[PDB]
Structures are given as structure tokens and as C-alpha cells.
């Protein structure tokens, strides 16, 4: 260890040092705090170079204005800052915005290695597409997002073979709402303007709610709040959206100027939350270029703070944040507004709603030819072999193995012969890839690619299996209830579980959700039942007249007994509906075959022989949930099994809650009844032209 160079007494700084995990991070915290304590970190007064008295505010907008052909069309530098798994949606958007005359510079979050490999294949095909060799971990609200933009601006200005006129930043959840031709016509007319949107409210309230008067430090992929600071004197501070369009002259100024304004603002915003939401506004309005500002970023942002402000980033930053919602089909009419010029919108998510994306793409660039496959489907990779089984969890690894075995048993039973069965397989190694599969915005299950030996010819084969969950929601004669579901990682903004498969292990903490229709207020009862009829929890909920979704995480002692749980909803003892979910036993511990003592410790129910303090044994007779002494002992025996016996217990559970819909081969096969994966409608190997990138057409487009 090592003591600080200063006495540290601020509550925020002490709370940060206590929660920080690495020695390097604790040192950086102390160093930052000390320097600010002595007044050597933040500037207190900054020179203003703008001759105006206040803001500029420039222009009158007519739809026909953007239908001319420019003699000198601008060439655009697109900077794409992307993360996550949605490579095929990114490919579709890249297809919509591509033109051979523009330029594309793609920064992939350091933590998204799968996506980076897919982007690399794009940059290798096209000479006007490059990827940043440096990669940052751009957490939400982090100071590193500004460092990302400023470094990409320096890189782009030094690429003398790319003569660009405008800088436009986009994420993987953006999409154009007007053609490239109209974008170029508009910007070619206003090439000396800068497009930034301000908050549109009270400026004092903007500063407080953004935390601009607080000192932040990014370290260990977290934003630590370290105390207060003053807004420097002599300049107007402003901000709004961090999505903008800036012309080359202003980017040159920000990058290379050494005047008092740029130097001190780069220092100030190195320790600022959400810095890109106000750094560029503050510099521009106080700089010599202040009279070039248009208070319009040419974007439609789907803000719905009723749903998007749930302080959902509290584990990443020491502050409460918000974010915009995903568009749905009913929002299409908003893209046709004429009040102000707009060319892009956000956010779009294909795993949330793809229909609106299709509507928008065909509206801008026309339908695909009749007979085009995959237009209503979506595939998203959630595991890729090069990232290693340690990037998975014991839960997902266990279940992905089980799904593969479920497919191999499907192949064997699907061949009807009295001779040698040439569709019997023995599994080998670990899954090569896993995909989510959607059709018409309905989740279809998982696709698992895996290797196996065909035992008839004794040869290795590569296969893909489609597994789909069995329907388990059941309503009963009696109503406002529409659906009930159990899962983890509930997304309060989009109102869905981000653990799409509902994959759960004994150490997971399930969440119960209900979906309601309109009607008067009502109160219902919720019952959780474990695989041997033990009632784990009971509670009543009020369903207010305006309620649409409700959810609750019951406090259950761990581990949960493995098997099929049941959740019941009653109304004054009158049954309403029920649902089921699976707590799967694990065949892996630290990615290794589980050992007897850890199997027994993990699969024999909770420690205190009870899930909560209060008991509900008084309810088993009333609800007809008798506890069978034989099943209880059998569950004890199951809890001590390993190897084959454990594999047989898991696979019988999985088979009861999942169905192997189909299985295909990627290459040659000896099984006479299996299609080639490329010939199927469902395989991740089947044609998907809406997300495929080919040769540049005569008009310079890919779409």
C-alpha cells in the first residue's frame, strides 16, 4: 500500500476509495483529489473569443429545397462508434449509408471482440473503410468517449488521401431517414455551418442535472464522483445531444488550436461526466466560429423519459442517467415530419423490433425483389468460439451443451430403418457458435453450431441445431392478465427480459413479471412453487388502473432446488393463470466437469432448508400441492449425481422444456435425412441478402 500525498476528507472521495478494487485505481483517485484540493487541476477563468453577445441561431426550411444536384458535392467522414453483438443490423445500416465518395472510420469497443472481427471483414473489402487501430472501453457516460472523438478527429485530419468536408458520428442503433442524395444536397448548401442541438430548457437546471459542477474520474471502467468544482468564469457553458455534424474547419480548430479556450476546456472535460454532450457546444459558442452554429443536429431522438429514466446505469457511474427508447412500427409517421430538416434517427434494435427498420429501409430505397429470403428474420451471435469458454458462464456452457445433445437425439430418431442407423452421433468438444433466432419479431430460440462424430462412418461432422422453448403460460377460466413470465436482467425501458432464453442456474435470482390490459384496479396473489412442491413465497400486488407491466424479485435463499418451478396467480383463491421456468443443474464448475462435493453443495436446495423466514406449509393442502416423500428423497439422490447420471438428469429436464426443431449439416454428411444448412430457411448459414455486402454498383451504392 501507500498513504496519500494529502489528507483526504471529502465524503465522495472516501466512498470512492472504499469501493475501488485495484491499487492503480485507488492511487489515481487520491492523486486527482489532492491536485484539485490544492487548486491545480481545474481552470477557474477562461478567455471568450466570440464577438457576439450571446448565441447565433441560424436558419426557414422547405422540402423541395433538397431536390437539386450540387456542382461540388461534399464528401462525408462517418465515424461509427459501435459495441455489442448486433453485427448484422450494423451491416444493414452501413449498406443504407454507403457511397463510394464518402469515408467510414469505425471504432469498436475494446470489450466487443466478436463485433470487431466482423467489422474487420468490412474494412478489408472497401478502400474507403478503415478501423481504428486503438480501441477504448467506452462505458456509458465515460470521459473516454470524448477522447475517442478527439483522437479520431486527429487521425482523420492526417489522412491526406481522404478529403472530407463534414464529420458525422453514428452508433449501431442509428438509421437514416432520408436518402444519401438528399443529405449531400443539404450539406453541400450549408458547408460552412455546424449542427449541434442544445438542451432546450433552463441552463442552470441543465448544469445541475448533468453533474457538470461535479468532479468525475474514469478508472477501472467506472466513473467515480470525487467532489464539487466551480464552473469557470468568463464563458457561456452550454450542452445538449452528443450527436452532431461538424465541418472540417471547426474540427481543425478543436484539434490543433492552442488558445486559452481549447486548452483549458480539454483539461476541464477530461474529468467530466457525459463530456461529449457539452464540450463541443461550449467551445463553439465561445470560439471564433460561434456564428456558424445551427441549433439543430438533424436527428430525431426517441426520448420517453417516462420509461427511459430509471437510473439504470448506477453500477457504472456515480450518477443517475437516462437513454432514448427504441422505435416501434406505430412511430413511422414521425419520420415524415416537415417542421425541421432531419436525416437520421435513433434508437433502433432488431432484437426489440425489426418491422420498423424494414418499413424505413424499403421506404427510402424500395422493396427487395420478390422471392428474396430472410427479409423477416434476424440472427444475432451471442457466443463465438475464438472468445473461449471462459467468456461464457457455467450456466450457459451447461445448457448450450445440453441443446446440442438434444439435437443429436433428434437426428437419430428421425431416421426410420432396421439396418445400421447412419444418423447416430457422439458429441465432441465445445459449441463453436450460438445465435439468437427471430422471425417476424417473435423469438424462435437458439441455433447451436457444434462438432460430432458420425458413428456409422466414424467421421467428424459439423452441425447446427435449432432449439425452441415449449409454451408454458396457461390461463384458466375466470380478466385483465395477458401474460406472465420469469427471467433475469429485466429491461425497464424496453419492458422485456434481456436473458432471452430464460437460462437459469441454482445461484440465479429469478424475477417474476406480469403484463396487464386496461381495466379497473385489481389485487392478485402470486405463489412460487419449487420442483418438490415447497411453496417458496407468497405476496399480493395492487394492479392500478393504469398499470401495464409489473415485476418483483422475491428474496429467496440460495441455492434454488433444481428442476421445474411453477408460478401461480390467484384472485381471491380463484385460479387465474400459471407459468413454469427451469432451474437447471450444472455440469460445469469453473468450466470444468463438476465434482461430487460441489455437485452436492450446489444441487440440494438452500442452506437454511427454507427460502424465506416465514413458512407457507399452511398452504400446501389448500392449493392441492401435496409434498410426496418419495420425490423429496429422489431429489436428494439427484443432488449427489455426477458424470453420466447428472447428464441424464439435466437432459431429461431440458427435454421437458425445450424442443429440437431441426438440425442440419454445414458440409458433407452421411446422415441421409439432413439438409445442408445453406438450403434451410432457419440456419445462420442460409441466405440473408438484406445484411450482405457485395460489389459497389455503377451509382456508387451497395443498396
Amino acid at each position: 500500500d501507500q498513504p496519500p500525498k494529502c489528507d483526504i476528507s471529502g465524503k465522495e472521495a472516501i466512498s470512492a476509495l472504499s469501493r475501488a478494487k485495484s491499487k492503480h485505481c485507488r492511487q489515481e483517485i487520491g492523486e486527482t483529489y489532492c491536485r484539485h484540493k490544492l487548486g491545480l487541476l481545474m481552470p477557474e477563468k477562461v478567455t471568450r473569443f466570440c464577438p457576439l453577445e450571446g448565441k447565433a441561431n441560424k436558419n426557414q426550411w422547405d422540402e423541395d429545397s433538397v431536390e437539386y444536384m450540387p456542382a461540388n458535392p461534399v464528401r462525408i467522414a462517418f465515424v461509427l462508434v459501435v459495441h455489442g453483438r448486433a453485427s448484422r443490423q450494423l451491416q444493414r445500416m452501413f449498406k443504407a449509408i454507403y457511397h463510394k465518395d464518402h469515408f467510414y472510420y469505425i471504432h469498436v469497443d475494446k470489450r466487443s471482440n466478436y463485433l470487431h472481427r466482423q467489422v474487420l471483414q468490412v474494412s478489408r473489402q472497401y478502400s474507403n473503410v478503415r478501423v481504428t487501430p486503438w480501441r477504448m472501453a467506452t462505458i456509458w457516460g465515460g470521459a473516454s468517449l470524448l477522447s475517442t472523438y478527439l483522437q479520431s478527429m486527429r487521425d482523420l485530419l492526417e489522412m491526406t488521401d481522404w478529403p472530407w468536408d463534414f464529420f458525422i458520428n453514428l452508433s449501431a442503433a442509428d438509421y437514416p431517414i432520408r436518402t444519401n442524395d438528399q443529405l449531400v444536397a443539404f450539406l453541400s448548401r450549408y458547408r460552412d455551418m455546424n449542427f449541434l442541438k442544445s438542451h432546450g430548457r433552463d441552463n442552470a437546471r441543465f448544469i445541475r442535472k448533468q453533474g457538470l459542477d461535479r468532479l468525475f474520474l474514469e478508472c477501472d471502467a467506472h466513473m467515480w464522483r470525487l467532489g464539487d468544482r466551480r464552473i469557470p468564469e468568463g464563458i457561456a457553458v452550454d450542452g445538449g445531444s452528443d450527436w452532431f455534424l461538424l465541418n472540417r474547419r471547426f474540427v481543425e480548430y478543436v484539434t490543433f488550436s492552442t488558445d486559452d479556450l481549447v486548452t483549458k476546456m480539454k483539461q476541464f472535460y477530461s474529468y467530466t461526466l457525459l463530456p461529449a454532450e457539452s464540450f463541443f457546444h461550449t467551445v463553439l459558442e465561445n470560439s471564433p466560429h460561434c456564428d456558424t452554429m445551427v441549433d439543430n443536429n438533424l436527428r430525431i431522438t426517441n426520448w420517453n423519459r417516462k420509461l427511459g429514466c430509471k437510473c439504470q446505469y448506477k453500477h457504472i457511474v456515480d450518477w443517475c442517467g437516462c437513454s432514448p427508447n427504441d422505435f416501434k412500427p406505430q412511430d413511422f409517421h414521425r419520420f415524415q415530419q416537415t417542421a425541421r430538416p432531419t436525416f437520421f434517427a435513433r434508437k433502433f434494435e432488431a432484437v426489440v423490433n425489426q418491422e420498423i427498420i424494414g418499413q424505413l429501409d424499403y421506404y427510402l430505397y424500395g422493396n427487395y425483389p420478390a422471392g428474396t429470403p430472410g427479409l423477416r428474420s434476424y440472427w444475432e451471435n451471442v457466443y463465438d468460439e475464438p472468445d473461449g469458454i471462459h467468456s461464457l458462464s457455467d450456466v450457459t456452457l451447461t445448457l448450450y451443451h445440453s441443446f446440442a445433445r438434444l439435437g443429436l437425439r433428434r437426428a437419430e430418431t428421425s431416421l426410420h430403418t432396421d439396418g445400421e442407423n447412419s444418423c447416430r452421433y457422439y458429441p465432441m468438444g465445445h459449441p463453436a457458435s450460438v445465435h439468437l433466432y427471430f422471425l417476424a419479431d417473435r423469438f424462435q430460440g437458439f441455433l447451436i453450431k457444434h462438432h460430432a462424430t458420425n458413428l456409422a462412418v466414424s467421421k467428424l461432422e459439423t452441425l447446427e441445431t435449432w432449439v425452441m422453448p415449449k409454451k408454458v403460460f396457461k390461463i384458466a377460466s375466470p380478466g385483465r392478465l395477458q401474460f406472465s413470465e420469469v427471467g433475469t436482467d429485466w429491461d425497464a425501458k424496453e419492458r422485456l427480459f434481456r436473458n432471452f432464453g430464460g437460462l437459469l442456474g441454482p445461484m440465479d435470482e429469478p424475477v417474476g413479471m406480469q403484463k396487464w390490459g386496461k381495466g379497473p384496479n385489481v389485487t392478485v396473489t402470486v405463489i412460487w412453487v419449487d420442483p418438490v412442491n415447497v411453496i417458496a413465497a407468497t405476496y399480493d400486488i395492487l394492479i392500478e388502473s393504469t398499470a401495464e407491466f409489473t415485476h418483483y424479485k422475491p428474496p429467496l435463499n440460495l441455492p434454488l432446488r433444481p428442476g421445474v418451478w411453477t408460478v401461480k396467480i390467484l384472485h381471491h383463491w380463484v385460479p387465474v393463470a400459471e407459468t413454469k421456468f427451469l432451474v437447471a443443474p450444472l455440469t460445469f464448475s469453473n468450466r470444468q466437469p463438476i465434482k461430487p462435493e460441489e455437485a452436492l453443495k450446489l444441487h440440494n436446495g438452500p442452506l437454511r432448508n427454507a427460502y424465506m423466514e416465514q413458512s407457507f406449509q399452511s398452504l400446501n393442502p389448500v392449493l392441492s400441492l401435496p409434498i410426496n416423500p418419495a420425490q423429496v428423497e429422489q431429489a436428494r439422490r439427484n443432488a449427489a449425481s455426477t458424470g453420466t447420471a447428472l447428464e441424464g438428469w439435466l437432459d431429461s429436464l431440458v427435454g421437458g422444456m425445450w424442443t429440437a426443431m431441426d438440425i442440419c449439416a454445414t458440409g458433407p454428411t452421411a446422415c441421409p435425412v439432413m439438409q445442408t444448412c445453406s438450403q434451410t430457411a432457419w440456419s445462420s448459414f442460409s441466405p440473408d441478402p438484406k445484411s450482405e455486402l457485395g460489389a459497389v454498383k455503377p451509382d456508387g451504392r451497395l443498396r
Binding site: 438542451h199 432546450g200 448533468q210 453533474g211 461535479r214 464522483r225 454532450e277 426520448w303 443517475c320
Partner: peptide, 9 residues
């Protein structure tokens, strides 16, 4: 259509 992602402490 107000802008800004911060939502207080």
C-alpha cells in the same frame, strides 16, 4: 424532445 442524458444524483 428535450435533450441531455443526465438525470441528477
Amino acid at each position: 424532445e428535450e435533450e441531455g442524458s443526465g438525470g441528477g444524483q
